[PDB]
Amino acid sequence: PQVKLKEGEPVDVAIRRFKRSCEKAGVLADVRKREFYEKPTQERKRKKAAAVKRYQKKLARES
Amino acid sequence: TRTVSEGVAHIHASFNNTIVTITDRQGNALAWATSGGQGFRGSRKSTPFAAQVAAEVAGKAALDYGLKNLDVLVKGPGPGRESAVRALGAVGYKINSITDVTPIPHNGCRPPKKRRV
Amino acid sequence: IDYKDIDTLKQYITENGKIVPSRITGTKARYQRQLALAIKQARYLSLIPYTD
Amino acid sequence: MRHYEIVLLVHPDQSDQVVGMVERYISQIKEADGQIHRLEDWGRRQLAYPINKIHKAHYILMNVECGQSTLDELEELFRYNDAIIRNLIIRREHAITEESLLAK
Amino acid sequence: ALTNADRAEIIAKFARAENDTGSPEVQVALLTAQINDLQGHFKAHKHDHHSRRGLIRMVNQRRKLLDYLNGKDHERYTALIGALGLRR
RNA sequence: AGUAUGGGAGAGGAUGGUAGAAUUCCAGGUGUAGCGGUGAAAUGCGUAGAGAUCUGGAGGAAUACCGAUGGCGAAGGCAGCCAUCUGGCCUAAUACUGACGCUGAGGUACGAAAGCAUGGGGAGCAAACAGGAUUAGAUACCCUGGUAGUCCAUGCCGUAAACGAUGUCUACUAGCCGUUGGGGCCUUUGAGGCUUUAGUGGCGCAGCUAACGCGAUAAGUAGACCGCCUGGGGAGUACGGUC
Numbered sequence: 001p002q003v004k005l006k007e008g009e010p011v012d013v014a015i016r017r018f019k020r021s022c023e024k025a026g027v028l029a030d031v032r033k034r035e036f037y038e039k040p041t042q043e044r045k046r047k048k049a050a051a052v053k054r055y056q057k058k059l060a061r062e063s
Numbered sequence: 064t065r066t067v068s069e070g071v072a073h074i075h076a077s078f079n080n081t082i083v084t085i086t087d088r089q090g091n092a093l094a095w096a097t098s099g100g101q102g103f104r105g106s107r108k109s110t111p112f113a114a115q116v117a118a119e120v121a122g123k124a125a126l127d128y129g130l131k132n133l134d135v136l137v138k139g140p141g142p143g144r145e146s147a148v149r150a151l152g153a154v155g156y157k158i159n160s161i162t163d164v165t166p167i168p169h170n171g172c173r174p175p176k177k178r179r180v
Numbered sequence: 181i182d183y184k185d186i187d188t189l190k191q192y193i194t195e196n197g198k199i200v201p202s203r204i205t206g207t208k209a210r211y212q213r214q215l216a217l218a219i220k221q222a223r224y225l226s227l228i229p230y231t232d
Numbered sequence: 233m234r235h236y237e238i239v240l241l242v243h244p245d246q247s248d249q250v251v252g253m254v255e256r257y258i259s260q261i262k263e264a265d266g267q268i269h270r271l272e273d274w275g276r277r278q279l280a281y282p283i284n285k286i287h288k289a290h291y292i293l294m295n296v297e298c299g300q301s302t303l304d305e306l307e308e309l310f311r312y313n314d315a316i317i318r319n320l321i322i323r324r325e326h327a328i329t330e331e332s333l334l335a336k
Numbered sequence: 337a338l339t340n341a342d343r344a345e346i347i348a349k350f351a352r353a354e355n356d357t358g359s360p361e362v363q364v365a366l367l368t369a370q371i372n373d374l375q376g377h378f379k380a381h382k383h384d385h386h387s388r389r390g391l392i393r394m395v396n397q398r399r400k401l402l403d404y405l406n407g408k409d410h411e412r413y414t415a416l417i418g419a420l421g422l423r424r
Numbered sequence: 425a426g427u428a429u430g431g432g433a434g435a436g437g438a439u440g441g442u443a444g445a446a447u448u449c450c451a452g453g454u455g456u457a458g459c460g461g462u463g464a465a466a467u468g469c470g471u472a473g474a475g476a477u478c479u480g481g482a483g484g485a486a487u488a489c490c491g492a493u494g495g496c497g498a499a500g501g502c503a504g505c506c507a508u509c510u511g512g513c514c515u516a517a518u519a520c521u522g523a524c525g526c527u528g529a530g531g532u533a534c535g536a537a538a539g540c541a542u543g544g545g546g547a548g549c550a551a552a553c554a555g556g557a558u559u560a561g562a563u564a565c566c567c568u569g570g571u572a573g574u575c576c577a578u579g580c581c582g583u584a585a586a587c588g589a590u591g592u593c594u595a596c597u598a599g600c601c602g603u604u605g606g607g608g609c610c611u612u613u614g615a616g617g618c619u620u621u622a623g624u625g626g627c628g629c630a631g632c633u634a635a636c637g638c639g640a641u642a643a644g645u646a647g648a649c650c651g652c653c654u655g656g657g658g659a660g661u662a663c664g665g666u667c
């Protein structure tokens with residue numbers, strides 16, 4: 001992140017630029033994933049469902 | 064007694080508690096307050112309001128050491144990070160930077176088992 | 181790609197130092213594999229940082 | 233034989249010794265057999281991250297062609313020499329002679 | 337491993353004609369050389385089963401070609417097994 | 425069906441070395457009352473100083489991002505980087521052998537995880553077990569700990585919803601839209617468009633099916649060989665035998 005703040009930037013606006021920086025980074029998603037161990041079977045099922053959803057989205061947006 | 068002008072604010076936010084530690088640069092601690100200290104026992108530790116109160120207390124305590132501009136680092140998920148950093152600014156500090164430093168393994172140790180609730 | 185091509189490597193690296201996925205930059209798969217290998221070799225050689 | 237590309241990182245305090253070691257490595261390669269197709273000295277570069285609490289290092293780039301015994305000897309020398317803090321060895325097809333980037 | 341020169345020497349020695357690379361003699365000689373070469377590898381890498389599968393395939397192919405040559409011409413079969421040292 | 429020669433992609437296998445992040449422990453600097461945990465709590469840790477924060481050490485295990493309805497392998501399976509040894513596959517055109525083929529009862533090789541034997545290792549996790557909760561009871565789900573094991577070397581065991589619940593090989597039968605590795609052709613300066621081939625996906629005509637559905641990766645149309653089924657329980661059990 002390293003959100004450095006300008007002379008005219010208010011404290012609240014600086015914090016807002018910050019949560020956008022961190023939401024773009026998506027570190028909290030990794031933190032959520034790390035907290036409990038997920039079995040390889042469940043991981044494979046999750047990725048399979050994600051791929052199916054991505055292909056459905058592609059088809060829907062194309063037509 | 065010792066006078067410092069620049070400082071660092073460490074926010075340890077979790078799903079259970081928030082800890083605010085004010086250090087000088089080079090990491091030597093000056094003041095610290097947590098949601099547990101200001102009442103809010105048990106489940107009440109994790110609310111953003113308790114984090115705001117703890118951050119205000121820590122900033123007021125560091126003002127005696129007398130530093131005016133600080134750099135904040137946020138480590139951890141959970142409520143209270145944004146409220147705590149807002150409270151530090153509302154005390155009268157000038158925040159110089161704000162960044163996330165939560166540790167992320169490169170697939171290291173195995174996490175605990177999933178809870179079946 | 182080659183690992184000494186540091187500016188081109190930085191073209192495909194975010195500000196955290198993470199590698200950008202192919203879906204975002206429109207890269208070909210074969211070119212992306214070489215780019216990732218070059219990035220890892222440069223990281224080991226310390227021409228670009230691992231993190232940050 | 234086979235073609236290899238070698239990158240050496242040298243402690244800046246011992247940069248005065250780089251010429252001697254590179255001459256002796258090239259001499260070993262030549263007396264055994266093979267060629268040197270590229271020698272480059274990138275100079276005193278800053279590191280992206282510290283290695284053994286050091287922030288700068290001397291970079292040497294070699295493109296050579298040599299045999300298995302020579303490769304083993306060079307690896308042993310790089311391992312046991314203390315001026316060398318990191319080394320990378322990469323097999324290549326065909327010999328590269330053109331002046332690389334990062335030479336400056 | 338064997339090189340192009342080594343393979344060319346075997347092909348030249350066992351060739352039955354000009355540019356003959358497909359005869360059972362040439363094929364069996366090439367397979368025998370490769371099998372004898374790989375025994376050094378499998379001495380130091382005893383637990384490499386994935387490559388041992390390919391080695392077994394080479395052995396089976398040599399056996400099939402030897403049986404075919406024995407069926408076609410017995411004299412050529414005996415000459416080839418004698419020249420290569422195979423027991424059968 | 426196979427061989428020689430050029431070129432190409434790959435987490436295919438075996439051995440050794442090495443890099444960065446993180447967890448745990450140890451020592452030290454700052455510093456002072458909590459920390460941790462839950463639905464709420466408690467067991468537990470802390471004024472011989474915890475938690476937090478900074479610097480430095482020790483050790484083990486696993487490789488974020490790339491990452492993909494992607495890739496490789498007979499299957500089981502295979503992901504940081506580098507070197508060494510090594511198997512298969514794809515692709516072009518010539519040259520060569522001349523049916524050398526397909527399948528396969530017995531047999532034999534490999535074969536997740538757990539488990540066993542001998543010797544090492546042990547960070548994290550965690551059967552058994554201990555304590556705290558919940559409950560009418562709780563032997564469990566939740567919480568704090570924690571041994572075998574998970575890791576390495578050398579062997580054994582031979583079982584999984586080992587699944588596409590779909591044996592292997594061959595030929596033929598509308599089309600449309602993706603994607604991976606190659607070959608060819610065309611535009612015209614560099615990126616696009618047509619084809620062709622080997623994989624991997626989504627629809628879908630005919631045909632098939634009890635229906636669901638399958639539909640050139642068939643469960644369609646045919647041929648070769650093998651394995652298996654004959655109501656539900658008793659029962660993959662008893663006796664005998666092999667290991």
Ligand SMILES: NCCC[C@H](N)CC(=O)NCCC[C@H](N)CC(=O)NCCC[C@H](N)CC(=O)N[C@@H]1[C@H](O)[C@@H](OC(N)=O)[C@@H](CO)O[C@H]1NC1=N[C@@H]2C(=O)NC[C@@H](O)[C@H]2N1
Nearest residue numbers: 044045048049050052053587588589590624636637638641
């Ligand atoms: N030449 C060699 C090539 C080898 C390679 N294998 C290629 C090949 O040969 N393929 C053959 C296709 C057969 C296929 N396996 C049968 C099938 O697909 N379902 C089994 C029939 C059950 C039932 N009659 C249909 C059914 O319930 N459907 C569901 C359904 O649509 C949907 O579920 C929900 N909740 O809405 C979806 C989302 O999960 O899941 C499907 N279920 C599944 N989708 C999976 C899938 O395709 N595979 C693996 C497994 O996971 C499959 N189950």
